[PDB]
Amino acid sequence: VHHQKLVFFAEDVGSNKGAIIGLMVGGVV
Amino acid sequence: VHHQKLVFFAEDVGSNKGAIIGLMVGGVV
Amino acid sequence: VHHQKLVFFAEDVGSNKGAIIGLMVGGVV
Amino acid sequence: VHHQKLVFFAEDVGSNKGAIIGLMVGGVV
Amino acid sequence: VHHQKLVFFAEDVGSNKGAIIGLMVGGVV
Amino acid sequence: VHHQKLVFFAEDVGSNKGAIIGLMVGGVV
Amino acid sequence: VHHQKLVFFAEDVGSNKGAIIGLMVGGVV
Amino acid sequence: VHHQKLVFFAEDVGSNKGAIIGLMVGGVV
């Protein structure tokens, strides 16, 4: 049977500060 | 507490030659 | 000898914002 | 929750010639 | 005497959005 | 359901005279 | 006493839609 | 012992490949 990609994301932003984050996401199989 | 976004993706990749499609995706409520 | 090309897609958009993605796609018989 | 887009395509070539066609295709729901 | 040139095609249309494709196509052996 | 078309093409162009033909074709089923 | 010509064709009649196409074909002399 | 509030995160990885993403997130002052 095929292996097919599902993903959960929630991004954290508030009052301007800085962190490790970024998001643009690519992947399959 | 925070709500999560559920997303599926499939990108198209074979015996290598190339196309326009693209994906690196990100965004929040 | 002949392979049939079949592909699944779903693009990601809700509420106007941005990401990097595109969809068009190419490959040929 | 909604359904996945399914794409099938055969491009017609035998013997070197020319035609009008394009494909780089995209859509969701 | 020559083998018969046979054309199969399907174009992608549904619920209104839009894509890049085109097709009106030609050839002979 | 609608009835399925089977059609074969080879195109007629020479020294200018005429007939009725054109061919660059799009369709489904 | 010259050698004869034969041809094969499929001519244009369908359930009405369009693309650029016709074949219904003949010559003189 | 100082008491601590907790947060859950998800980074996207199973099976080695890559993407541009992170969230592991903080702030100071």
Integer Cα distance of D28 and E15 in angstroms? 9
Q: Kindly determine whether residue G15 and residue F9, on different chains, have CB atoms separated by under 8 Å.
A: no
Integer Cα distance of E7 and D23 in angstroms? 17
Using CA atoms in the order G28, E1, G22, D9, what is the torsion angle rounded to 10 degrees? -170
Taking an 8 Å Cβ-Cβ cutoff, which residues of chain F contact chain E? Answer: 7-11, 23-29
Residue C24 exposed, middle or buried by CB count within 10 Å (0-12, 13-18, 19+): middle
Structure tokens, F18: 């005429």
- The DSSP secondary structure of G1-29, one letter per residue, reads -PPP----------SS--SEEEEE-----
Q: If you measure CA to CA, which chain E residue comes closest to F13? A: E28
| Method used to determine the 3D structure | NMR
**Which structural domains are found in chain D, ordered by start?**
1-29 (4.10.230.10)
Structure tokens, C29: 């018989």
Q: Residue C28 contacts by C-beta under 8 Å, 6 or more apart in sequence?
A: D11, D13, D23
- The DSSP secondary structure of E3-26, one letter per residue, reads PP-B--------SS---EEEEEB-
Q: Kindly determine whether residue G21 and residue F19, on different chains, have CB atoms separated by under 8 Å.
A: no
Task: Report the amino acid identity of residue G29.
Answer: V
